[PDB]
Structures are given as structure tokens and as C-alpha cells.
Amino acid sequence: LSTKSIEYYLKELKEIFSQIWLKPSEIEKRCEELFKRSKEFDYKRILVSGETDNTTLYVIEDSSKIHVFSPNRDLRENPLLMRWHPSWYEIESKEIYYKCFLSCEELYEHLELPTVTLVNLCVIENFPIPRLNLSTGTLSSYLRKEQLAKVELIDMQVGTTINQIIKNLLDSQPDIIGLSVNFGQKKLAFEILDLIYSHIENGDLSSIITVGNVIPSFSPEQFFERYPSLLICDKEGEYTLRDLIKMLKKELKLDEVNGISYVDESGEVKHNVAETVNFKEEVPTPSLDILGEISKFRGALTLETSRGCDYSRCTFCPRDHKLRSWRPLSVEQTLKQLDDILRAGKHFNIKPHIYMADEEFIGELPNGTEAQRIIDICEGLLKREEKIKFDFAARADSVYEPKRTKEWNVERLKMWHYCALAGADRIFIGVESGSNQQLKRYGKGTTSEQNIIALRLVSALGINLRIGFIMFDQLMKGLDNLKENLDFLERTDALMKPIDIGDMTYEELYDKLLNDKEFIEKHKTGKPVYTIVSYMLASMEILMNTPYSRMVQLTERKEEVNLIMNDGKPDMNMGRYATSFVDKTNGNLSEACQMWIDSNFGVMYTIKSLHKVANPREKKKLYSYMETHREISHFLLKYLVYNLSPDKESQIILSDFLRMHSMEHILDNVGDGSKENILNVMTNWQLIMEKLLRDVEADLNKGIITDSEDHRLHNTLKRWFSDMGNWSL
Ligand code: B12
Ligand SMILES: C[S@@+](CC[C@H](N)C(=O)[O-])C[C@H]1O[C@@H](n2cnc3c(N)ncnc32)[C@H](O)[C@@H]1O
Ligand code: SF4
């Protein structure tokens, strides 16, 4: 092969490899056709490995002549060649993109890659709209970039069924099978596992079996009881899979494999230490094998630009699986991976909107440069030809922290401005509470006024907001925290319209939003905070391994009460404890609010479903229903608390709200927090929901809104009217 004809094969390979959405078997197909075409030499076998900018073709003429093409990267950085021969190459050399290896017998053994099949489970009835699965996509890209294995990806999100999974597995004959098992997928996982082991027993498969993600990590005993040879990946999967591949080659013993729990021969459960992955530089662009099918389901692009939480102190948030340190992608890798995913999505006409999976997008570094890192990512996005939109999550104190200097906070505001400039769209802030006592119980580290100011600053930059809010928690005593929460949620001095920066410095804008009451009033949207709450009337869920669960167990012993039911055991499928409230009135209110939600779910689901596809004028009508429902749901709790503990100010607000909707006389005990009385009070309040749904009914009859073909709004409205006051579950 001439030195000029190297160049031609590289040129065409670069064009093949640029199509990063194709599965590796499809890439190999195009490589075979390119090499059979020139017919200026024949070969026995080809292998493609690597990914995106390091994709590599091996052409095995036989074991004594092996050609290696690396169009996108210096072959000297190839990790498979480096494992085979750490000094094969010349250090003083122009970059090398081709090399023929002659009489290199052991290189062939390195090119016999094991096969790994990774399966993302999905209960499709609960999640109709897929998102690119990072759980398996990053495990695949890590293995491909290290050239450790041929990886097959199966995603139940796009409709692949249990029986199709097994068919796939029989056809590919993998050496390692891995299932990602998430909340609510225990039964599905056990079904797939039963069939895998049934076929191992029958001799149709021989594979190391492993499961990963949070459900088996937290509850390994229920898995080991049914599958005692199963290997559970406790934390990150990358090095775990690397080491199972080594163990396949007898290069590691089982008790050396990174980050797994297993049953040894004596019957005892072992856990191996998990070395935290070098995420900054070893985990590349998620594999995009499934992207085409995801686009057919109108699915979403996703990326994780950091792992972990440097704060890690919220008492309801368990840190054992996700870890207590923050590991960011480099600015360079973040921009590259975003470019890859956006280019691949554009190929399938997926719109350029990235959902960042990060637990904490902004983070914190020992050198304090985290804000400059974000600004540098934003500057890179602003250099692109096309704009993007992106969503992410952040704590309120990643916006505003009065324990830090004014200069820290002013630079924080500049950072958030660059986020808005680069496309920050809907941002989730974990406010969680409006009550300083409850915030302390939540370990949030924030105050209620600090939360208000964070919302002011972000909303003023034109970023749209969503907030988590956990109204009820089991250790709350009395109604005081609920009153503080309701007052917080009714504040109208928090949400700002997008403010034109004009000539203001960052410091002047910051100063005005903190202190200038007239500025705040002029720019407010006038909407109360509860309008951006993600889930109204939410109650605490007590997950395993949390400080909050231990706080509960500690109240159980200190006041001699049995709060954790199921005889102290947790639920494996949901990774949480079933727990009752220390204050029985508060538990009654939480239960009532869940029943309220259940009673309106069918009709409000239908309204929201119709809203997705309505014309502009119907969309606004249906949206106004959803706004009014949220409003009625907020003042349900204000009304319940009023009937348990009245005050003058709350009475005025409820009377204002009634009078505002021409329905002050629709409503006509006290201090009685029994379930019976609360239900009776809520039956009364439900008359206000009836008044809203009578308008929906009239609008439907008038043709002002349009029903689905199966008459779903008609059907659910009819049921709702017939079910009034009838709180059976
Ligand atoms: C997207 C998302 C959702 C989506 C789910 C989308 C989907 N795919 O169906 C929605 C919005 C529906 C959701 C809901 C919930 N979620 Co959520 N979610 C996330 C989020 C933001 C991103 C997930 C992701 O892509 N992670 C990145 C990938 C790379 O990580 P991974 O899945 O853990 O995979 C790694 C390891 O687990 C391991 N691994 C995974 N699979 C496998 C397989 C094998 C074989 C092996 C060996 C290893 C392995 O290797 C991988 C790479 O290192 C995460 C935050 C996060 N960054 O993880 C929260 C998170 C997972 N969610 C969480 C929670 C609590 C919930 C809810 C209960 C809501 C709530 N907060 O009350 C519900 C559950 C609903 C249900 N399903 O029943 C918690 C989980 C508990 C915890 N603290 O660890 C997280 C961490 C957020 C938080 N801090 O509160 N979630
Ligand atoms: C939407 S995710 C993103 C959280 C992310 N760590 C952050 O800091 O912003 C978590 C949100 O779900 C809600 N949530 C989490 N755990 C919960 C629990 N155990 N019970 C009730 N709500 C919970 C909280 O409102 C929280 O803000
Ligand atoms: S809730 Fe958010 S900030 Fe709190 S520990 Fe969990 S990831 Fe970190």
C-alpha cells in the first residue's frame, strides 16, 4: 500500500466515521465495502473500535499482517496498541494515522474483543416519551474509547419487548450482559433475569450477568436471594465493566473487580471498593446507537456534564450511589460532547434542546473557579452558528449566598447571565421549603428570604423557572411550618419579568433586585411563587440511606412511637420507607392532599394532554384551566389550615379568592383535625373545583374546546361530577 493510497483510505474512513449515529456493525459494513472496492489487497477480517474522534479500523490480512487506520487521532494514543506494546511508536515523530504491524502474533489476541450487551429497562406505559439513555450510553462509549469490548445497546424506551431482548441476546452471544434497573423496574428486571438464566442453563447463552443503577445498589439482598451468582454494580459502571472484562481474560479475580457486591462461595456478601471514575477525561460522548429510534418517538437529547454533588447535605437526598464529591467534565469535553449530540440530533431532525442530567450543574471547585468554567462553556456555545436551548438544575445558593462576599454574588449573577445568553431555558431550583425550621430539617442550608432572592435574580435574567417544593414532612409538629410555607408560596415579590440590562453593571442590577423595593415592584410579574412549583402539595418520601430516615428512626426511639411501617423494612422496588407522621393532624392533611390529587387526576391529565396538541386559542383556554386548578389546589390547603387554626389575615385572603371568582357563597367544626372533619372540609372546597369544571364542560359543549376522538374529556368530566364528595381512595 502506497503512502498516497493510505491518504485515500483515511479520507473515506473519516467520512464513514463522521456518521456517529450509525451502529458499529453498520460502520463496519461501510468499511468492508470500501476495502473490497479498490481490490488492491484482500483481507481476512475487520474490526472497528474507538468512538467519535478516535474511531479506529483494524484490517487483519492475517495474524502476521494487521493494518490500523485512525483518521481522527494520532495512532500513538491508541489504548489497545499501548496495552499490547507500550513502546511500539516513536516519540519524536509527526502524528501517525496508519501503521501496518508485521509478525505481531499477540496483537491478534488483543483484537479479539469480548462482547458486552447493555439493556436499559423501561416500563413504557409510565414513560411514553424517551430520552437518550446516558446510563447505558456512557458505559458503551467508555468501553469503545478504551477499545475494551464490542458493545451492543438495547433500550426498552423505544418499544423493545422482553421477548425481543432475549432474541437479541441469543443472536449476539455476549460475554457480559448488563441491565440498568431503575425505580419501579424490579418486576421487569426479575422477568428478564429469569429468562436470561433459563437460557444460560439451557446452553443458549454463557455470560457474566451484572445489574446496575440505584435499585440493586441499595437493595442487593433481594437480588442475591433469587440470583446468587449475580454481580451488582454499586456505583459507577465504567471501571466495573472494565474489570469484568479483565476477569473474563483471567487477569483479575472476582474480589479485585471494581465496585461490585457479590456472594462469595461461603455465602457471605462481599463489597469491593469502587474507585471514583476519572470522569473529566475518560468518559466521552454517550453512544448514539439508539438516537434514530428515539427520534421516531420524538425523544429528547441529554448530557451529563458533571457527576455528584459537592454539597451533599440535604437530609432527604441519599449520597451513597451518586457520591459526595463533584466531578466536572472539562470545558473542552463539554463543548465537544454537546457538538456531537447536537450534530447527531440535527441529522434526525431532533430540535436543538439539551436536558442536562447533572445533579448540580454549577458545582464548586477547591480553587473557586467553577463560575469561570460555566462562563467558558457558555462562551463556547455562543461561538456556534446555531442557537441552542438547555435545561439544568441548581441549588438556590448557586445563585445567591449572603454568607459569601458581594463580589462572589455579583460574579455569580454574571455567570447566570451568560447561561441565559447561551440558551438556558427552564431551570429547576431545589427551593424545597418556605419555612426556616423546615429548611433546617431538610438540611438545605438556605433561608426562605434567600430563596426569594435567588428566584428574583434568575427570573430577572429571562430564564424560566421550576422549583421543587416539599410541603409536608413527617417530623413536622403543628401547623406553623405549613403557614410559613403558604405565605412564602403566595409572595408576589419573587418572580421578575425579564429585565433589560440596558447600561447597568452587574453590581447595579444585583443591588436593585436585593434592596430597591420600587425596582422590584416595577419589574415583578405579579404571579405568586406557587405558580412555578413542580408538584403541588407534595409530601416527603423517605429514601433508604438518608439522614432524614435516621432522624425518623431517632424520633421513633426518643418518643417511643412507631413511625416506620412495614416492620421497619424498606421497599426494594421504590428504594424508600413507608412512614407515618409524628403529628397526626399533619399526616391527615398530607393524606387529604393526596386524595385531592387522586380525585382530579383523570380530568386534569386529559386537559393537559389536549393542551399539548391544541390550536393557539384553545391552548390558552386549556392552560387557563390548569392555572385555575393549581390556584384552587393551593388554596385548598390554605382553607384546611384555616379551619384548623383560623387567623384574620388568612380569612381575608380566602374571602378575596372566593370573591374574585364570583363564588363567595358557594361556601357556607373548628380546630378539629380528625380525618372525618378534614374530609368534610375538603368536600366543601371541592365545590370550587366543580365550578371550574362546569366551565370546562360548558366550553366543551359550546365547541370552544375540542375533545379527543375517544371522548376522553367528556368521559372524565362525567365521572368527576358523579364522584363528587365520594373519597373512596
Ligand atoms: C432523568 C432523571 C429522571 C427522569 C427519568 C428518565 C428516564 N430515563 O426514564 C425522571 C424525571 C422521570 C425522574 C424521576 C425520578 N427521579 Co430522577 N433523575 C434523573 C437524572 C436527572 C438523570 C439520570 C441520568 O441520566 N443519570 C446519568 C447516568 C450516567 O447515571 P446513572 O443512571 O446512575 O448510571 C451510572 C450508574 O448508575 C451505573 N449504572 C447504571 N446502569 C447500569 C447498568 C449496568 C449493567 C452497570 C454495570 C452499571 C450501571 O453506571 C452508570 C455510569 O457510571 C438523575 C440525576 C443524575 N445525574 O443521575 C435523577 C435522579 C436519578 N432521580 C432521583 C429521584 C429521587 C427521582 C424520583 C423518585 C423523583 C423525586 N425526586 O421524588 C423519580 C422516580 C420516578 C420513577 N421512575 O418511579 C435521584 C435518585 C436518588 C439518589 N439521590 O441517588 C436522582 C439522583 C436525583 C436527586 N438527587 O434527587 N428522574
Ligand atoms: C427534581 S430532582 C433535582 C434535585 C437536584 N439535586 C437539585 O439540587 O436541584 C429533586 C427534586 O425532587 C423533589 N424530591 C426529591 N426527593 C424527594 C423526596 N424524597 N420526597 C419528596 N420530594 C422529593 C424535591 O423537591 C427536589 O427538589
Ligand atoms: S438535593 Fe440537590 S443539592 Fe441537595 S444533596 Fe441532593 S443533589 Fe445535592
mmCIF file of N, CA and C in Angstrom, residues 472-477 539-542 548-549 551-553 555-556 559-569 576-591 675:
data_model
loop_
_atom_site.group_PDB
_atom_site.id
_atom_site.type_symbol
_atom_site.label_atom_id
_atom_site.label_comp_id
_atom_site.label_asym_id
_atom_site.label_seq_id
_atom_site.Cartn_x
_atom_site.Cartn_y
_atom_site.Cartn_z
ATOM 1 N N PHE A 472 -45.138 18.944 52.942
ATOM 2 C CA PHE A 472 -45.344 18.123 54.134
ATOM 3 C C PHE A 472 -44.124 17.254 54.409
ATOM 4 N N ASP A 473 -43.673 17.215 55.671
ATOM 5 C CA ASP A 473 -42.721 16.182 56.057
ATOM 6 C C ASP A 473 -43.107 15.616 57.421
ATOM 7 N N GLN A 474 -42.672 14.372 57.654
ATOM 8 C CA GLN A 474 -43.248 13.537 58.707
ATOM 9 C C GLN A 474 -42.864 14.007 60.099
ATOM 10 N N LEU A 475 -41.735 14.694 60.242
ATOM 11 C CA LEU A 475 -41.299 15.171 61.552
ATOM 12 C C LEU A 475 -41.836 16.553 61.893
ATOM 13 N N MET A 476 -42.665 17.150 61.033
ATOM 14 C CA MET A 476 -43.217 18.467 61.337
ATOM 15 C C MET A 476 -44.227 18.386 62.484
ATOM 16 N N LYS A 477 -44.136 19.335 63.413
ATOM 17 C CA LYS A 477 -45.002 19.382 64.591
ATOM 18 C C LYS A 477 -45.816 20.658 64.527
ATOM 19 N N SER A 539 -45.516 15.655 49.449
ATOM 20 C CA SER A 539 -45.092 15.117 50.739
ATOM 21 C C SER A 539 -43.740 14.428 50.640
ATOM 22 N N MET A 540 -42.993 14.471 51.747
ATOM 23 C CA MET A 540 -41.674 13.854 51.789
ATOM 24 C C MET A 540 -41.736 12.352 51.531
ATOM 25 N N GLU A 541 -40.812 11.866 50.714
ATOM 26 C CA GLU A 541 -40.544 10.441 50.571
ATOM 27 C C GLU A 541 -39.227 10.131 51.267
ATOM 28 N N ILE A 542 -39.227 9.105 52.097
ATOM 29 C CA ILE A 542 -38.099 8.811 52.972
ATOM 30 C C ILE A 542 -37.294 7.704 52.298
ATOM 31 N N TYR A 548 -32.464 11.857 56.800
ATOM 32 C CA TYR A 548 -33.832 12.031 57.258
ATOM 33 C C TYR A 548 -34.395 10.723 57.796
ATOM 34 N N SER A 549 -34.117 9.596 57.128
ATOM 35 C CA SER A 549 -34.593 8.315 57.647
ATOM 36 C C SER A 549 -34.015 8.047 59.032
ATOM 37 N N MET A 551 -33.043 10.432 61.140
ATOM 38 C CA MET A 551 -33.766 11.354 62.019
ATOM 39 C C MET A 551 -35.099 10.768 62.455
ATOM 40 N N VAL A 552 -35.786 10.075 61.548
ATOM 41 C CA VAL A 552 -37.068 9.472 61.896
ATOM 42 C C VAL A 552 -36.861 8.336 62.890
ATOM 43 N N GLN A 553 -35.952 7.402 62.568
ATOM 44 C CA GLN A 553 -35.643 6.309 63.486
ATOM 45 C C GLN A 553 -35.243 6.832 64.862
ATOM 46 N N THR A 555 -36.355 9.769 66.229
ATOM 47 C CA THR A 555 -37.590 10.189 66.894
ATOM 48 C C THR A 555 -38.418 8.987 67.339
ATOM 49 N N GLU A 556 -38.349 7.877 66.598
ATOM 50 C CA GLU A 556 -39.054 6.660 66.992
ATOM 51 C C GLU A 556 -38.606 6.180 68.370
ATOM 52 N N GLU A 559 -39.319 9.271 71.439
ATOM 53 C CA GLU A 559 -40.692 9.486 71.877
ATOM 54 C C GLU A 559 -41.499 8.192 71.879
ATOM 55 N N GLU A 560 -40.853 7.056 71.609
ATOM 56 C CA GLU A 560 -41.464 5.731 71.738
ATOM 57 C C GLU A 560 -42.684 5.587 70.831
ATOM 58 N N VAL A 561 -42.506 5.955 69.564
ATOM 59 C CA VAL A 561 -43.569 5.905 68.570
ATOM 60 C C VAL A 561 -43.105 5.037 67.409
ATOM 61 N N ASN A 562 -44.052 4.374 66.759
ATOM 62 C CA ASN A 562 -43.759 3.512 65.615
ATOM 63 C C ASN A 562 -44.197 4.247 64.342
ATOM 64 N N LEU A 563 -43.248 4.957 63.721
ATOM 65 C CA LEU A 563 -43.483 5.757 62.519
ATOM 66 C C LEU A 563 -43.164 5.015 61.232
ATOM 67 N N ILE A 564 -42.128 4.186 61.227
ATOM 68 C CA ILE A 564 -41.722 3.458 60.033
ATOM 69 C C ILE A 564 -42.476 2.132 60.013
ATOM 70 N N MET A 565 -43.395 1.987 59.059
ATOM 71 C CA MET A 565 -44.241 0.806 58.973
ATOM 72 C C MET A 565 -43.518 -0.282 58.173
ATOM 73 N N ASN A 566 -44.251 -1.297 57.705
ATOM 74 C CA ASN A 566 -43.645 -2.488 57.103
ATOM 75 C C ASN A 566 -42.599 -3.091 58.045
ATOM 76 N N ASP A 567 -42.864 -2.995 59.354
ATOM 77 C CA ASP A 567 -41.997 -3.537 60.406
ATOM 78 C C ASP A 567 -40.556 -3.060 60.248
ATOM 79 N N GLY A 568 -40.397 -1.767 59.963
ATOM 80 C CA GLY A 568 -39.092 -1.170 59.781
ATOM 81 C C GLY A 568 -38.446 -1.404 58.431
ATOM 82 N N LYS A 569 -38.905 -2.389 57.663
ATOM 83 C CA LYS A 569 -38.265 -2.698 56.396
ATOM 84 C C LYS A 569 -38.546 -1.599 55.374
ATOM 85 N N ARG A 576 -37.370 3.078 49.213
ATOM 86 C CA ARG A 576 -37.868 4.055 50.174
ATOM 87 C C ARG A 576 -38.597 3.338 51.302
ATOM 88 N N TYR A 577 -38.825 4.074 52.389
ATOM 89 C CA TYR A 577 -39.550 3.590 53.555
ATOM 90 C C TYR A 577 -40.969 4.134 53.535
ATOM 91 N N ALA A 578 -41.924 3.290 53.909
ATOM 92 C CA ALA A 578 -43.288 3.729 54.172
ATOM 93 C C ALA A 578 -43.355 4.218 55.616
ATOM 94 N N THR A 579 -43.656 5.505 55.803
ATOM 95 C CA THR A 579 -43.539 6.162 57.102
ATOM 96 C C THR A 579 -44.767 7.017 57.374
ATOM 97 N N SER A 580 -45.221 7.029 58.627
ATOM 98 C CA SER A 580 -46.329 7.882 59.034
ATOM 99 C C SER A 580 -45.823 9.105 59.798
ATOM 100 N N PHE A 581 -46.723 10.076 59.990
ATOM 101 C CA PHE A 581 -46.385 11.399 60.507
ATOM 102 C C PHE A 581 -46.411 11.419 62.030
ATOM 103 N N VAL A 582 -45.436 12.112 62.630
ATOM 104 C CA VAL A 582 -45.410 12.213 64.086
ATOM 105 C C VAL A 582 -46.567 13.068 64.597
ATOM 106 N N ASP A 583 -47.033 14.027 63.804
ATOM 107 C CA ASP A 583 -48.164 14.881 64.157
ATOM 108 C C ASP A 583 -49.362 14.393 63.340
ATOM 109 N N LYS A 584 -50.379 13.835 64.016
ATOM 110 C CA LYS A 584 -51.456 13.139 63.297
ATOM 111 C C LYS A 584 -52.299 14.080 62.444
ATOM 112 N N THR A 585 -52.462 15.333 62.857
ATOM 113 C CA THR A 585 -53.180 16.283 62.018
ATOM 114 C C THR A 585 -52.435 16.504 60.697
ATOM 115 N N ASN A 586 -51.123 16.736 60.775
ATOM 116 C CA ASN A 586 -50.322 16.930 59.566
ATOM 117 C C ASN A 586 -50.364 15.711 58.659
ATOM 118 N N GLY A 587 -50.301 14.514 59.242
ATOM 119 C CA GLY A 587 -50.472 13.307 58.446
ATOM 120 C C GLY A 587 -51.833 13.232 57.784
ATOM 121 N N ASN A 588 -52.870 13.682 58.493
ATOM 122 C CA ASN A 588 -54.205 13.740 57.917
ATOM 123 C C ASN A 588 -54.263 14.737 56.770
ATOM 124 N N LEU A 589 -53.602 15.882 56.920
ATOM 125 C CA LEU A 589 -53.608 16.868 55.856
ATOM 126 C C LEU A 589 -52.863 16.353 54.630
ATOM 127 N N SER A 590 -51.703 15.710 54.837
ATOM 128 C CA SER A 590 -50.957 15.106 53.735
ATOM 129 C C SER A 590 -51.809 14.081 53.004
ATOM 130 N N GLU A 591 -52.462 13.197 53.761
ATOM 131 C CA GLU A 591 -53.350 12.208 53.158
ATOM 132 C C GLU A 591 -54.485 12.880 52.396
ATOM 133 N N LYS A 675 -59.575 12.953 60.612
ATOM 134 C CA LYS A 675 -59.743 12.631 59.197
ATOM 135 C C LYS A 675 -61.158 12.940 58.729
#
